[PDB]
Amino acid sequence: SWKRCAGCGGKIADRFLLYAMDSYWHSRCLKCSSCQAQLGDIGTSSYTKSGMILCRNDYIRLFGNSGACSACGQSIPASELVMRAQGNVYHLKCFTCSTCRNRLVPGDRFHYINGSLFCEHDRPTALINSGGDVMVVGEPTLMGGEFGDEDERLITRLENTQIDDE
Ligand SMILES: [Zn+2]
Ligand SMILES: [Zn+2]
Ligand SMILES: [Zn+2]
Ligand SMILES: [Zn+2]
């Protein structure tokens, strides 16, 4: 006899169905609590936390480590790429030379003195007489960084040949 869907309570007569969180589901019934996406089609896993079943992006958004821009002071979502320097994070558009206002990009040479950024061609000689050191702009990284998989629950797609992997 058919399995019951944990999402709707109904028997699952569909040819293809999902297994996740120890339960069977109609694919349409396994949805992100926040954005309603159909988890089994958009990706390979779900996240469980605080009564919710979430897609990866909303899990990051609601529970990942957000930060704040050292230049403008405003929060940075976990999902946003940031520039890094001397232990600070910056909005990409905030990562600019304090003298000429050029936006600094990966591979650029730059100087840092007491929070102020300077491009290679605006070396602040007057200030320098630790800022003498030339640094290389790194690639942008995600604000949230790496996170553990302890709330991740893989989704398995199954075929009922009326149960086999898909
Ligand atoms: Zn259902
Ligand atoms: Zn979502
Ligand atoms: Zn900023
Ligand atoms: Zn400059």
Numbering used by the authors: 19 to 147, 297 to 329, 336 to 339
Share the article's original sentences:
In this paper, the advantages are explored of collecting X-ray anomalous data to identify chemical elements, such as metal ions, which are key to understanding certain structures and functions of proteins. By comparing anomalous peak heights or anomalous difference Fourier maps, specific elements can be identified and placed in the crystal structure. In this paper we used this method on three test crystals, LMO4, thermolysin and lysosyme, to identify zinc, calcium and chloride ions, respectively.
